[PDB]
Design a protein around this ligand. Structure first.
Ligand code: HEM
Ligand code: HEM
Ligand code: HEM
Ligand code: HEM
Ligand code: HEM
Ligand code: HEM
Ligand code: HEM
Ligand code: HEM
Ligand code: HEM
Ligand code: HEM
Ligand code: MMC
Ligand code: MMC
Ligand code: MMC
Ligand code: MMC
Ligand code: MMC
Ligand code: MMC
Ligand code: MMC
Ligand code: MMC
Ligand code: MMC
Ligand code: MMC
Lengths: 145, 140, 142, 146, 140, 145, 146, 142, 140, 145
């Protein structure tokens, strides 16, 4: 149920469908900041907490954003395979357990922000599945935070 | 090292390969497979990530992070300031494990032996330059 | 000897080996062309059903009949009382003819061989076949 | 009345199922039922098998006869494709009944309908027509000259 | 009830169906699906076996045991003495859960609605008799 | 590894390959007792412990044997699907936990006996896979016994 | 640790390439390298083959032993599908080492990793896992009761 | 006799004839079923690896082993020094058994025959095979 | 340079590629295509063989001789004494045309970019060694 | 006619059929000397004329043989394409025009020797086509010699 074979398939489709054969290779950053901005608003969290401290034009923060988007990409792209997804998330978990400032309710915030921006960009985006799956990803990362 | 144009070739060929390919997890394990097959000394070097069993959740989960990060880099290749930072972040994530310059030179051997099989066209040099441009940033 | 398991394995392979319709003539010929090779002196026992012309309608009937019986056996191998009785009739049907003692042994070899070729030597259990194929002849030749 | 090409195939099917070349037991039930009725509708007939523990269906001697028969009919249902051969096989089976004092044509009519009662209880989606058409084809040749 | 010949038809048709069919687990869930769809009252009656989720490891694992046991019975149908015993063993495994005679009559409704779809030929009566011959032994 | 997709596939093939379209429907008992006999020898366990107490001709014990073989059948037939296999075994476990006389080393004994008889009957029987898988089944049933 | 169905196929592949049923020479190099290390990591071991010009790899007597071995392992890698048979073949190969005074279990561990070094230098895209999993399957049965 | 070219042609056809996995048992049986036919007196030399039951696990191992050796030969046919040494060991492995001189000749016929059937009589070079198959036996029987 | 084992990998992979491939002439032109695309300076360096038109009888006829000779070498790789001689013969067939060490290093770049696309598996190093072991003999 | 599409196809088949997936990669030399020997006999030509001067064990002569066989291979393998074959041969021609000792009747001799050895090695060898084609190859190489 919670993000099944077809759901993921669709998400992984759409997610790529966004990073398609014409895009993925230029402005993941445009998408990325767009993400972080919707993050900072919903979550309320302070940008004064990341490398470069937000600032869409800070060389550090960009790298940061890229690094975040890619994490989400590694996971999204591997939802079809349960076993290895749990792992990938668990590891992400550990990385965040190690940082004072992360909350369970906050991860979901950032997780929901992805889905959203994904849909602004790709209007078709099956928002029911995206939330279904991103909700799952939200668990593995915020496990116990 | 990896110039403006040599970047292009690669950026596309990587997508054309890692991109198009079926299930990355294969490709990913596939890569580390070599790294080991071209330098066994390293195989044990990943003792903390279920390297014992290359078909494990734990292990594959790693290979991904790599072909993954390895992705978040080729994409940023044009962004000098961004990729350097990212590259720096990466370097200090390899500071703990003792790595010689025969591992990085080995890694890029594994990469450059995996990739061309998945393409119709692949530029040896153009790749070396960028694998280089990347290896450096991640080591010293 | 012919263990409850052999009977199992024999009943099975025999099922597979026993074709359907004319594919039995296939198996049939196989066991005959052999028996008559190794022992030509035996083709004379059947001058009645045209032993010479293994391919005649007469003999094919006959050939087929034989496999018929031999199938009942295999099928009864499980329940002994009946088998006995089966071999009994058979026995009384070969009592007349002057079948050489050295004939059944050969027939069994030609059959066991025939079945092998048919079901394939996929580790064909010779011990089980022979063991059970012999339990059969006994009631007939004796 | 002609047991057609379809009819034989369609019969060999009906008789494919409700059949096991592996185990005698099934054949035995199918037989006994054929017999159960045969007699039930011609008590007198029963006497023909005195040479078999007829009065004790559930007996070896008898279950052995059932097999012998059920098998004969299987042996023939299979020649149904290669007539030339079948002919001899019936011509044979014939003589074996001519040899049995008594058993006359009429009897293969009781035996006819006897089977006609049993099959639908053994074979799934049975084609009575094809069976009554081919079964005859055989019984004719057996009870012929009898 | 289920006679010598009526047994045959069934024995084959069951194999011809449950036998041939793809993955029993489907067929198995498939069956219980009905039992519920033809008598909801029962759905809760399996509260101890993850009945909440019919696609669970826990649940499917049950449906099997049934179409399974249901198998170890049709095969023993000719063995009067053996199947009665087996049937008895089974009855006292249904002694705890309170079952009315509208459940068994419901079960055999579920069964007889699943099976014929998977076959070319299927004998209504012949089945009823045996499903009966089985239901009895398992209830009273 | 331990009993993989193809292994099971092969076992489930062969196992049926034994109970094929010509057999499965008469003497599972012949196979079954054959099993129990090879059991009683290897395991040493006393037949004086089962319904009817062994006795290949005791109406109770037969039913027993059938019930055992079928259990093994339910499991064998569902090795391809990991999730539901673990369950099916676990349940079997519980049934045996509830009986004084069952040992871990004994379940494997009875488990190995199946494979064996399977091979006597079907000479092809890929004995490497059978043991690989039956070994797994041996775990779920003898978990903690 | 179980040498799976895939593992054997995947191994028979690795060992399909880096192989010629036509010419000995290749087998010889692959062997010698296996040996080259074996010794290099257990000089003492070298002594076990005194009954072969070990001290002179590049010598007939020795290249002949390499073939004899490389072949044995090929003979087994191929039974990897028909276990029943393999069992005997190892059970055999076993006794032949029990016959050789010295050579104990431990040695098949040095020989184990010896091969584990050579293959990637002979077979293209080698599956270390499947090889280490199946190679064991064999070496176990040989060095068993040794 | 066994010219550098024959060795060529022999190495090849042998490659093709030498199946893979169980397909060797295929070739193997072929050469055995023959040898034992023409010369049944020979099936007794193998009472150890179950000569009677050509299909047993014992014999199939054995059967296979033989082809194993025979493959090394063919593979070494090129380089003589090794071959010598190979045949040497083999020879010492058949020194014990009481193998009749009239056995190797037969084995060779059964093999050469076996290989033919397998690779097909597409002009099978009997001269080359025999020529080289004999160079082999010599070091073994003698 | 190119060892006993590194020779194997290559010998097979070359056949596995140049061998299996469809019409060598393609592959052959294909190769020289690169040599030019990775070092234009050379394109004119073959002015005597219709290099103007890469699809000519004259031109293709050359590319062959090369992937051809290039073949008569990989096969002789195990024959130290034979390939050295052959290699020497070859060197003095390149004495006239002035060739720098950036052409040979370029050639082997063209080769190693053509080959891996045609295979499932291809060992970077193992090839470099032998392409080297060959380049040397043909230059100095 | 003279070595048509199918002929060449067959030759190129057989020629490879000889250098098949199990051979081509060890003793082209065995085949090669075998060639040169049949050459020296039919042609009568003196081996005292080649690198190393014959001597099947002279490191130079081997290389020589290899170089010859390969030439023949380059040509054989490209008979299907007329245009480029003429070329390949013409070039070979020029190489031999440049050597005192080559005759027209001699090239054919060496050319016929290939076909022959090919047939000793591969008994199937459609000798009618081989000669038909090798005869053609004989022309391009011995053009005017
Ligand atoms: C959807 C969930 C999230 C994703 C995709 C994600 C994933 C990642 C990844 C991939 C990294 C880099 C790993 C590395 O250090 O190598 C990272 C770092 C980090 N994350 Fe998250 N994250 C998520 C949510 C959050 C939240 C909710 C916060 C806090 C508001 C947060 C704050 C940080 C910080 C501060 C770092 C370390 C900065 C650095 O790398 O130097 N993350 N995250
Ligand atoms: C140039 C290519 C490389 C890239 C892009 C790369 C990528 C990565 C990344 C992203 C991680 C995981 C870090 C995290 O998410 O916390 C990692 C970990 C690691 N890498 Fe690399 N890496 C490269 C080179 C190498 C080489 C050449 C070696 C040695 C042979 C190596 C050894 C390791 C080890 C030992 C770890 C730690 C994993 C553990 O055992 O916990 N890496 N690498
Ligand atoms: C495995 C054991 C055998 C089986 C299944 C078998 C069965 C049969 C059957 C079914 C008949 C027809 C009986 C009738 O309808 O009156 C028959 C007849 C006959 N059998 Fe056998 N038989 C076997 C072995 C042999 C052997 C060993 C020989 C001699 C080499 C032999 C020779 C004959 C002869 C001479 C006839 C009479 C020919 C005729 O008029 O049909 N049988 N057998
Ligand atoms: C069309 C169906 C029938 C077939 C194919 C058939 C089959 C056979 C066969 C195979 C035998 C045993 C052969 C032997 O003598 O060794 C036999 C004998 C016999 N049959 Fe028939 N039969 C048929 C119909 C009948 C009918 C209608 C009757 C009479 C009511 C009958 C009466 C007998 C008797 C009395 C025996 C001998 C039993 C004894 O040993 O006393 N058969 N039959
Ligand atoms: C005639 C068909 C039936 C068969 C063959 C059958 C089969 C089984 C078997 C074998 C088990 C598992 C026992 C064990 O392994 O310990 C079981 C359990 C059970 N059965 Fe049946 N059953 C049948 C009828 C029914 C019906 C009609 C109902 C009610 C609607 C029912 C209710 C249950 C319940 C509640 C359990 C206990 C499972 C639990 O919740 O723990 N069964 N049955
Ligand atoms: C491969 C492992 C085994 C299988 C397939 C198996 C499975 C089963 C099954 C399916 C049942 C019937 C469940 C029920 O009560 O509804 C059962 C019952 C039982 N088993 Fe096992 N079993 C195994 C091993 C053993 C061992 C090692 C022993 C002891 C020596 C044993 C002794 C018993 C006994 C005494 C019962 C209860 C008797 C009864 O049903 O009234 N089992 N087993
Ligand atoms: C798993 C890999 C191995 C296989 C398949 C293998 C293969 C063989 C074969 C086929 C022979 C020749 C048969 C004969 O006696 O005629 C042999 C003998 C021998 N093996 Fe092994 N072997 C293996 C491992 C080892 C190891 C680990 C050692 C010890 C360091 C060893 C020591 C020997 C010795 C000493 C000989 C006899 C050489 C002589 O003639 O002196 N083997 N082996
Ligand atoms: C072409 C020549 C032959 C080959 C390739 C060959 C090779 C072999 C091989 C590989 C072994 C196993 C040695 C060991 O592991 O100890 C063996 C054993 C044996 N061979 Fe031969 N052999 C040949 C011909 C013959 C002939 C002509 C006979 C007799 C008719 C024969 C009879 C035996 C016997 C009796 C054994 C021992 C059986 C055993 O215990 O394995 N061989 N042979
Ligand atoms: C390592 C790879 C090489 C091999 C095996 C090779 C092969 C050959 C062969 C066999 C010929 C024809 C000779 C004849 O049959 O008379 C040739 C000619 C030639 N090669 Fe190379 N060659 C290699 C490297 C190079 C490189 C790197 C260059 C320069 C970019 C080069 C430039 C030439 C030129 C200019 C000719 C003369 C053709 C003409 O214009 O008449 N070669 N080579
Ligand atoms: C079927 C026809 C022939 C083929 C395949 C052939 C082809 C070749 C080839 C490929 C070369 C090497 C080219 C190079 O120098 O780069 C060569 C060289 C040579 N050929 Fe021929 N040839 C043939 C006939 C002959 C004949 C009939 C003779 C004289 C009896 C001959 C004598 C020579 C000599 C002496 C050389 C030069 C030695 C050297 O390379 O240092 N060839 N030939
Ligand atoms: C679906 Hg994780
Ligand atoms: C370390 Hg994958
Ligand atoms: C012979 Hg039934
Ligand atoms: C009369 Hg059965
Ligand atoms: C109870 Hg499914
Ligand atoms: C395989 Hg559970
Ligand atoms: C010891 Hg080769
Ligand atoms: C016979 Hg090597
Ligand atoms: C010079 Hg192509
Ligand atoms: C045919 Hg050039």
């Amino acid at each position: 149920e919670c993000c099944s074979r077809g759901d993921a398939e669709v998400v992984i489709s759409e997610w790529d469908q966004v990073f398609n054969a014409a895009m993925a290779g230029s402005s993941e950053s445009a998408v990325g900041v767009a993400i972080f901005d919707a993050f900072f608003a919903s979550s309320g969290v302070s940008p004064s907490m990341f490398p470069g401290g937000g600032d869409s034009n800070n060389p550090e923060f960009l790298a940061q954003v890229s690094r975040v988007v890619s994490g989400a990409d590694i996971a999204i792209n591997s939802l079809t395979n349960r076993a290895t997804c749990d792992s990938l998330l668990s590891h992400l978990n550990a990385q965040h357990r190690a940082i004072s400032g992360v909350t369970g309710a906050a991860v979901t915030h950032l997780s929901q922000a992805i889905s959203s921006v994904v849909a602004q960009v790709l209007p078709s985006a099956h928002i029911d599945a995206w939330e279904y799956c991103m909700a799952y990803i939200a668990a593995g990362i915020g496990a116990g935070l | 090292v990896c110039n403006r144009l040599e970047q292009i070739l690669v950026k596309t060929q990587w997508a054309q390969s890692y991109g198009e390919a079926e299930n990355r997890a294969a490709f990913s394990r596939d890569l580390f497979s070599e790294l080991f097959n071209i330098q066994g000394s390293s195989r044990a070097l990943f003792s903390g990530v279920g390297v014992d069993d290359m078909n494990s959740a734990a292990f594959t989960a790693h290979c991904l992070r790599v072909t993954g990060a390895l992705n978040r880099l080729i994409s940023q290749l044009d962004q000098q300031a961004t990729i350097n930072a990212d590259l720096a972040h990466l370097a200090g994530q390899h500071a703990s494990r003792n790595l010689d310059a025969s591992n990085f030179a080995a890694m890029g051997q594994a990469v450059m032996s995996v990739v061309p099989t998945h393409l119709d066209c692949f530029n040896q040099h153009a790749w070396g330059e960028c694998y280089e441009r990347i290896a450096s940033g991640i080591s010293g | 000897d012919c263990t409850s398991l052999n009977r199992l394995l024999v009943k099975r392979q025999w099922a597979e080996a026993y074709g359907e319709g004319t594919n039995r003539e296939l198996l049939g010929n196989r066991i005959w062309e052999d028996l008559f090779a190794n022992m030509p002196d035996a083709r004379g026992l059947f001058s009645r059903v045209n032993g010479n012309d293994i391919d005649s309608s007469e003999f094919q009937a006959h050939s087929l009949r034989v496999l018929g019986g031999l199938d009942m056996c295999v099928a009864s191998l499980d329940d002994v009382p009946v088998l006995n009785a089966l071999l009994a009739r058979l026995n009384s049907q070969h009592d007349s003819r002057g079948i050489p003692a050295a004939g059944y042994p050969a027939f069994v070899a030609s059959a066991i061989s025939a079945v092998r070729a048919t079901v394939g030597a996929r580790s064909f259990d010779n011990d089980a076949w022979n063991s059970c194929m012999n339990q059969i002849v006994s009631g007939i030749s004796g | 009345s002609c047991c057609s090409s379809e009819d034989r195939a369609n019969v060999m099917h009906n008789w494919d199922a409700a059949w096991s070349a592996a185990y005698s037991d099934r054949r035995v039930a199918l037989a006994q039922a054929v017999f159960a009725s045969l007699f039930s509708r011609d008590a007198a007939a029963q006497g023909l098998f005195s040479g078999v523990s007829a009065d004790n269906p559930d007996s070896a001697d008898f279950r052995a006869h059932c097999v012998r028969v059920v098998n004969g009919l299987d042996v023939a249902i299979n020649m149904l494709n290669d007539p030339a051969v079948l002919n001899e096989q019936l011509a044979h089976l014939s003589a074996q009944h001519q040899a049995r004092a008594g058993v006359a044509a009429a009897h293969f009519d009781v035996m006819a309908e006897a089977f006609a009662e049993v099959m639908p209880q053994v074979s799934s989606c049975f084609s009575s027509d094809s069976w009554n058409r081919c079964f005859a084809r055989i019984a004719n040749g057996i009870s012929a000259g009898l």
